[PDB]
Amino acid sequence: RCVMNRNGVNEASVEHFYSRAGLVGVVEVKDSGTSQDGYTVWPIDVMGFVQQRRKLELSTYMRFDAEFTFVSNLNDSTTPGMLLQYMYVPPGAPKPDGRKSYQWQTATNPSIFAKLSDPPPQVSVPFMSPASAYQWFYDGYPTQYGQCPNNMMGHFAIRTVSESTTGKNVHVRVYMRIKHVRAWVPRPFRSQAYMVKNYPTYSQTISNTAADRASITTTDY
Amino acid sequence: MVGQICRYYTQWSGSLKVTFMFTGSFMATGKMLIAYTPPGSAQPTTREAAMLGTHIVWDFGLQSSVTLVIPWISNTHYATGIVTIWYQTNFVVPPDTPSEANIIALGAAQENFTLKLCKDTDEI
Amino acid sequence: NIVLSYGEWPGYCPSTDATAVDKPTRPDVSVNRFYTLSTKSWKTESTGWYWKFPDVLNDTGVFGQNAQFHYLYRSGFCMHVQCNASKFHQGALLVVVIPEFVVAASSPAQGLYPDFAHTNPGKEGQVFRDPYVLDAGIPLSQALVFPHQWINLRTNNCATIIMPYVNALPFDSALNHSNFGLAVIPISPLKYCNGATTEVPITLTIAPLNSEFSGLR
Amino acid sequence: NIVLSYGEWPGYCPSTDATAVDKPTRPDVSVNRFYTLSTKSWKTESTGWYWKFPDVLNDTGVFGQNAQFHYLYRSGFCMHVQCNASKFHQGALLVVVIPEFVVAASSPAQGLYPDFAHTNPGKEGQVFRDPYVLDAGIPLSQALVFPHQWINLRTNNCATIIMPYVNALPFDSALNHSNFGLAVIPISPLKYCNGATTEVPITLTIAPLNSEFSGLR
Secondary structure: OOOOOOOOOHHHOHHHHOOOOEEEEEEEEOOEOOEOOOEEEEEOOOOOOHHHHHHHOOOOEEEEEEEEEEEEEOOOOOOOOOEEEEEEEOOOOOOOOOOOOHHHHOOOOOEEEEEOOOOOOEEEEOOOOOOOOEEOOOOEOOOOOOOOHHHOOOEEEEEEOOOOOOOOOEEEEEEEEEEEEEEEOOOOOOOOOOOOOOOOOEEOOOOOOOOOOOOOOOOOO | OHHHHHOOEEEEEEEEEEEEEEOOOOOOEOEEEEEEEOOOOOOOOOHHHHHHOEEEEEEOOOOOEEEEEEEEEEEOOOOOOEEEEEEOOOOEOOOOOOOOOOEEEEEEEOOOOEEEEEOOOOOO | OEEEHHHOOOOOOOOOHHHHHOOOEOOOOOOOOOEEOOOEEEOOOOOOEEEEEOHHHOOOHHHHHHHHOEEEEEEEEEEEEEEOOOOOOEEEEEEEEEEOOOOOOEEOOOOOOOOHHHHOOOOOOEEOOOHHHOOOOOOHHHHHHOOEEEEEOOOOOEEEEEEOOOOOOOOEOOOOEOOEEEEEEEEEEEEOOOOOOOOEEEEEEEEEEEEEEEEEO | OEEEHHHOOOOOOOOOHHHHHOOOEOOOOOOOOOEEOOOEEEOOOOOOEEEEEOHHHOOOHHHHHHHHOEEEEEEEEEEEEEEOOOOOOEEEEEEEEEEOOOOOOOOOOOOOOOOHHHHOOOOOOEEOOOHHHOOOOOOHHHHHHOOEEEEEOOOOOEEEEEEOOOOOOOOEOOOOOOOEEEEEEEEEEEEOOOOOOOOEEEEEEEEEEEEEEEEEO
């Protein structure tokens, strides 16, 4: 009927708001048919999905640590003993060009060796920006408009540790948990549909923030 | 009066005082930019240029009168600055209010003004 | 009376490793003075105006000289927005300071990227195309989370906002990064009766606060 | 608020050899009261008005009786000039007290001598012919060396000047010597819009201060 009491303040904190591990990317390691790459390079994008992009863009500046979990299996959900390498390429480091490129052996690129039959690999990436916080909104030019390169968090290059093609596609579900989040300068929530991935661009067909009703005096929609 | 007395002398120096009086309606409002240019430069060409030097932004609706102080002028046997009045804003009035008004400018000398070498006037 | 943005008085930056070896320049009244921009004519059909900081003062007076010929910059701003309206004029203006005001382009349902005249409007400022979404895809109704003041013509004709330096870095390039945008948006449109002045002047006066410069070219 | 002429409060004359043998008459509220003259209509084309003192009160009430039937006279004056203007009326009046206001005649380029109606206008006063030269060959712009008050219709509608007795003699004839003239000159002409009252009333109220009379006839 009516909640007589108060719900507490814990779940209204910024720490709780930006918490819980969430899907930030579905990486496919194709090794069969027309795509026998046997590896994939996935740029770390906290704003891959619109739901998370809208929540993060409530802030202007944000400092956090990210914990990544890789949930990997084959097409039919099976997890055999295939060995996989999860390489973290820090910002400003070369990326692998092929299945057996020399960047897979670079010691300064941290790697995780895990089997598909193992529980999901997990690792914490620290705060990586040259600035004191990540900028979701940068109003200026590097030297395109609004493209700050200080929000590069790195790359996850994933391959099967194999000699020739295995004929098996590996689906990697990347889960990211924001940790020790601090947010600066609250902003309005986005009200328009996102057009592109890195811009505030919106369509000329502007949608009204509030749903329409018949008249300013009626209370039925 | 200071202009008439200075013609009885050959040399003078000191600070001047200029007061502006707006005599429009009580309902009239707007902004003028009152700019002083020191004796070095010429008359400013734009309000933007005048805003960079010594200036006052004067609002009619708040103050009917403003005092400008010229820090130093001098003459010898002219080395004078220039005062310019710019339209910072449009002249704004409600309906049934005159859209034309007047400014009365008054001039005087400060407490540090002096006169040297008494000299008969050429006015009379 | 005076809106202090985020309850933070502008101040000089604490000791920095880069600024310890060569102490940054702190200019005085010569730079930190009042700059009065060109007046904006508020009309019935006006959608509003915005200015980028410090882009607005980047080619104006001694501040413009320091901004262009220094590698690094840091400053707070004291901004006065004044109206000259009669008691027979009506309307409401929202004056909002938007940190990192990234202006979006509008794609016909394809301009997805705003031009330099919109991102860096200069001292003359820019008019809003879609003030409802602040030209940035975010609703005007929620723009009150930013530091703001109302100008209701029947109560007050002036707004004062003090904005400190807000950035992820202690210093930045004045010429290619705008720390914040100042937007003036008529919420309630200007109305008047025949014989009144058809426009209400809007004057923006800016005073840099605790300006700092480093690496003079 | 109140202009005190020459920073001198009006007062009774010090002991005099002539006034020692027969003490001068010092009248009270019966004489020293407020006299309200006829109102003057300020119009757009008005050039201004002047009054001579004590010629203005020489045929009015008990003061006029004392002035006519006494050989000698001495008095200060407290003069109030009031306007009745709306906030939709605009204009500036200068109210100036001119000691020994000798009115000049204007010779066509031959009236070299003003008539009695101009030298002694009475209680009705006289209109200026050439307010630019104050009808006396001296510029209006420099008339601010005399005791004066501005009436700017947008700030104040009343002026008060207290003029003490100023003469080379401690007493003089009221009927044939005017100590000072009171001039009201519109500097900024009266402007208004259609439907407003076409004239602004100007009211002069006079109070004699420390009046002294000697040698009653």
